Design a protein around this ligand. Structure first.
Ligand SMILES: N[C@H](CCC(=O)O)C(=O)O
Length: 270
């Protein structure tokens, strides 16, 4: 393990980091003031895994803007809805939860049952894709429910994005005008409160950044993290998306790769 870990630590650019883990790494670092992007494989497709949940939540928030009280609607959590990864919803089997609380749960813990219940509320993967298209993202696409959506095959575009498409979408939705201000602020706060990314991009980013993020993974080789970086001292935010497939290293080493993306990105911002 030591040589691979040492090579990951020594990598000072994204191409070298990809080589150090024998993986396929897609990164976009986006300066929201200028639109300038730096990265690696920015326009190749990668499986979203749970990174899509940011946009499922955005779809809910967008629908709530035209459906008064949607966020307060209560949705039953049934035994049949529960999946292996349901850390919040498991305590509510046999009762219900608000749509708003399901959104928070799916963002900050990646709760899979919460996501499937929200898919039922909004009209499924087609409604999330339609939201993405209407927002100006012609690339990202939601196709399946949990847990099937986490599969990937080259040439199979289901449930995929590109680093650059997702970065632009985070800008438009989390920072821009796709949602009303109170909706976008609620979504930003959920991302800021994420609990699953402590070993990923956040571990490589310094204290000058307030970070919101959403992670994803599968059991084969995928580990992802997408983030918005607000400068605590003020100024324009940055967006950092990172998609990795690296089957030759461990799950924990995949986090180390994402942390190194953060370290490289922080130095590139300056
Ligand atoms: N597929 C994982 C969620 C399920 C799990 O962690 O077991 C993710 O992308 O966050």
């Amino acid at each position: 393990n030591a040589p691979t870990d040492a090579a990951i630590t020594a990598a000072s650019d994204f191409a070298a980091l990809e080589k150090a883990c024998a993986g396929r790494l897609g990164v976009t670092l986006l300066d929201t003031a200028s639109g300038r992007r730096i990265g690696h494989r920015q326009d190749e497709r990668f499986p979203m895994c749970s990174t899509f949940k940011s946009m499922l939540a955005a779809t809910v928030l967008s629908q709530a803007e035209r459906m008064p009280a949607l966020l307060d609607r209560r949705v039953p959590v049934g035994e049949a809805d529960l999946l292996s990864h349901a850390p919040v919803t498991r305590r509510h089997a046999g009762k219900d939860m608000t749509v708003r609380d399901l959104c928070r749960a799916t963002i900050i813990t990646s709760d899979n049952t919460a996501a499937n219940l929200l898919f039922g509320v909004v009209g499924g993967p087609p409604a999330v894709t339609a939201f993405l298209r209407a927002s100006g993202d012609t690339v990202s696409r939601s196709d399946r429910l949990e847990p099937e959506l986490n599969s990937f095959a080259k040439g199979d575009p289901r449930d995929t994005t590109t680093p650059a498409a997702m970065a632009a979408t985070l800008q438009r939705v989390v920072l821009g005008e796709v949602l009303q201000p109170a909706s976008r602020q609620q979504l930003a706060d959920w991302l800021i409160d994420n609990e699953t990314g402590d070993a990923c991009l956040r571990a490589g980013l310094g204290k000058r950044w307030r970070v919101g993020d959403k992670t994803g993974s599968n059991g084969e080789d995928a580990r992802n993290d997408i983030a918005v970086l607000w400068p605590v001292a003020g100024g324009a935010p940055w967006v950092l998306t990172a998609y990795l497939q690296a089957g030759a290293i461990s799950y924990e080493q995949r986090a180390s790769v994402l942390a190194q993306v953060g370290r490289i990105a922080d130095r590139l911002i300056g």
